[PDB]
From Swiss-Prot, chain A:
Subunit relationships: Semipurified toxin complex consists of at least YenA1-YenA2-YenB-YenC1-YenC2-Chi1-Chi2. The Yen-TC:K9 subcomplex is about 26 nm tall and 22 nm in diameter with 5-fold symmetry and 5 copies of YenA1, YenA2, Chi1 and Chi2; the chitinase subunits may be solvent accessible on the exterior the complex. The Yen-TC:K9 subcomplex has no insecticidal activity. The native complex with additional YenB, YenC1 and YenC2 subunits is 16 nm taller and is insecticidal; the toxicity-conferring subunits are present at about 1 copy each.
Full protein: residues contained: 99 to 147 of 1364
Transmembrane segments annotated in the record for this chain: none
Phenotype seen when the gene is deleted: Cells with a disrupted yenA1-yenA2-chi2-yenB-yenC1-yenC2 locus are no longer pathogenic in C.zealandica larvae.
Organism in which the protein naturally occurs: Yersinia entomophaga
Protein name as it appears in the record: Toxin subunit YenA2
Length: 49, 43
């Protein structure tokens, strides 16, 4: 980030943002919970079960 | 004893390249380049 202004700038921007678009469709957080979840998402067609 | 003409050279290429390199420290080996930029949130 500090390698470059815009690089660093973007870093700053994100670190400013309370949230606008962090939109955790994915995330730093993980457990195989996450892959399990994904498997649930990707199998077949979605359903409440 | 021996029978020259000034041509038995070419060995100096090391020095030559060095010298060039130094001049391209004073500047740059062909031209000087230009930088790159970045993007947000997509970041």
């Amino acid at each position: 980030f500090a390698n470059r202004y815009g690089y660093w700038a973007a870093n700053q921007q994100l670190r400013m943002f309370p949230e606008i678009y962090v939109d955790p469709t994915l995330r730093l957080t993980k457990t195989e919970f996450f892959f399990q979840l994904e498997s649930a998402l990707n199998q077949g067609k979605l359903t409440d079960d | 004893d021996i029978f020259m003409y000034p041509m038995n050279n070419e060995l100096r290429g090391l020095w030559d390249r060095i010298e060039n390199r130094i001049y391209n420290l004073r500047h740059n080996l062909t031209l000087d380049g230009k930088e790159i930029n970045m993007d947000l949130y997509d970041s």
